[PDB]
Design a protein around this nucleic acid. Structure first.
Lengths: 179, 178
DNA sequence: CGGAACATGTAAATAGTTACATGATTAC
DNA sequence: GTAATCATGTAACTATTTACATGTTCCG
């Protein structure tokens, strides 16, 4: 049984009303993009698939004067299909891929200097990313409970922030042992 | 623009200390390294062929028992440099690290059901943490340092541990809000 | 004996990225 | 002007998983 995560990502994204393929692409680049993403080149054929499967519907609006655009709504099938996925308990994956950690495992092939340089570089990026994430949190807070319509936003953002805090503190631990 | 070919570097790295079979490589992906990279044998064997055709690795045929053949792969000079350049290269950090649970979490708007789904995730992640702590204790029993031949193993284990601790702690925080 | 682990491949499919293509609207 | 962004789609390729397919060795 093929997983088809993207199908559920699209269906989930449409849960509060119509969106274009472009809007979908745009959401994968905002806060959700820390945990799932797809290129437009994957999304458009899939939108066609989901329509043929009868989970979604589209109408054709016009931006400006002659630019066509396709708004998508969930169907009865779509909402249910979505829901049957949402509450389904899934096994946690063994692997969550990280190319840096793969490098970490092969550390013996590096001299103290080379490893220090590698790990230092990673930290500076990870801290830069941490800044961007910390800033976003604040921009969200001025704008928190389960009732909140931004609770989904809050979840992905706090997770992403924690994830980078953890990565920074970990790297600093190894650098203390390296240097 | 140029294929990452991460699987090529996972293999060359796995051979950095000497010869291995495709079977051996498959196994390493099922042990502590599997927390951060895995491949199936069906991907590994064709890739081993490809790397041999590319001159990064070589192989001999050894015989287990009486008549079972085994190809043991070794790095070439060209492969060691290939490994080296990749290790010291500064790659940009990925925007997305995929997590299907966190996708689900984004769609919470669709109270009891959210509690159950998170409680289950808490329990499963508590379990994975217990297994990881156990493995960390097995490693430590056998004076850790950069010089230590098990530094890599230590790194992947600590990271995996930090990862679950932080996941478990997060899920608790969110559950108390709900 | 029998089952787990060892050992190696290929086929068919899904999943994902990069490159190829085009054109319209917004704001400076 | 012109650049960035909005907007949609197809082609080729790279990556990964599940299933198919075979046979040996170790150990109790």
């Amino acid at each position: 049984d093929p997983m088809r995560v993207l199908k559920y990502a699209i269906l989930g994204l449409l849960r509060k009303g119509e969106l274009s393929g472009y809007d979908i692409t745009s959401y994968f680049k905002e806060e959700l993009g820390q945990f799932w993403s797809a290129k437009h080149s994957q999304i458009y054929p899939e939108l066609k698939k989901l329509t043929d499967e009868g989970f979604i519907t589209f109408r054709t609006t016009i931006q400006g004067t002659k630019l066509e655009k396709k708004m998508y709504t969930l169907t009865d099938s779509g909402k249910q299909e979505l829901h049957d996925w949402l509450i389904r308990h899934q096994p946690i994956p063994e692997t969550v891929k990280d190319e840096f950690m793969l490098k970490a495992y092969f550390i013996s092939s590096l001299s103290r200097q080379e490893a220090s340089d590698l790990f230092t570089d990673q930290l500076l990026k990870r801290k830069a990313k941490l800044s961007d994430l910390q800033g976003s949190y604040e921009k969200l807070m001025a704008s928190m409970s389960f009732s909140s319509p931004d609770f989904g936003h809050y979840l992905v953002l706090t997770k992403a922030l924690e994830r980078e805090k953890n990565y920074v503190s970990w790297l600093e631990s190894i650098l203390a042992m390296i240097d």
